[PDB]
Amino acid sequence: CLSIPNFPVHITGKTQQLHVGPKPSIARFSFNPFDLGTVFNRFQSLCAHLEGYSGDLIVNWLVTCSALTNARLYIIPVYDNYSFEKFSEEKLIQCKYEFKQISLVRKGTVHIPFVNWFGSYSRTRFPKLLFYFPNGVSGPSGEKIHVTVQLDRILNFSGLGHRLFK
């Protein structure tokens, strides 16, 4: 298997809107570089022939709101490709998750350690990062906050396999 200590990919995900309101909101960002779009990203140009890879992800996350907008933010990893519609805040506080007020901390970097039951990420196995606003978002009269993430790099990269070039 090829090993890459640092592998920059600079892939930015789609920016996701959130209208202001009291309803609990979730923004899901899957981190699947094997996912193809209009252009092939730096990951696919060099390691798309692989069947699966392994390594820690670094993600730059950003929440753009007004200066008079309040919200609590829970950044939650989701491994092994599970689907969560609702979160139990009791469970999050029991796991010592700390929420951040987007009126004070609305920029950050998330290190995602490698966690997969199968042993590697793939086209079908990838981590998810869920931005969970439990109280919704309280903003000025029709605001939409935007949550945008960028997969910055992959640390301690390892990859195996050899797919067919379709």
In the region spanning residues 60 to 119, those forming contacts with other proteins, defined by CB under 8 A, are 60, 62, 64-72, 75-77, 79-80, 82, 84, 86-96, 100, 103-119
Query: How many binding residues for other proteins (CB under 8 A)?
Result: 106
d(CA 31, CA 49): 18
Report if residue 20 touches other proteins, rule: CB under 8 A: yes
Report if residue 124 touches other proteins, rule: CB under 8 A: no
Q: At 47, is the secondary structure helix, strand, or coil?
A: helix
DSSP for residue 13: P
Report if residue 39 touches other proteins, rule: CB under 8 A: yes
Report if residue 134 touches other proteins, rule: CB under 8 A: yes
Closest approach of Cβ 28 to other proteins, in Å? 14
Considering beta carbons, is residue 28 or 138 the nearer one to other proteins?
138
d(CA 114, CA 55): 6
R_g (Cα) of the chain, nearest Å: 17
Q: How far is residue 124 from each of residues 8, 9, 34, 69, 116, measured CA to CA in Å?
A: 22, 19, 9, 37, 11
Report if residue 123 touches other proteins, rule: CB under 8 A: no
Report if residue 6 touches other proteins, rule: CB under 8 A: yes
Q: Which of 58, 34, 32, 53 is nearest to 45 (CA)?
A: 34
Report if residue 30 touches other proteins, rule: CB under 8 A: no
Report if residue 144 touches other proteins, rule: CB under 8 A: yes
Report whether 149 contacts 59 (CB < 8 A). yes
Residues in the chain: 166
Considering beta carbons, is residue 1 or 30 the nearer one to other proteins?
1
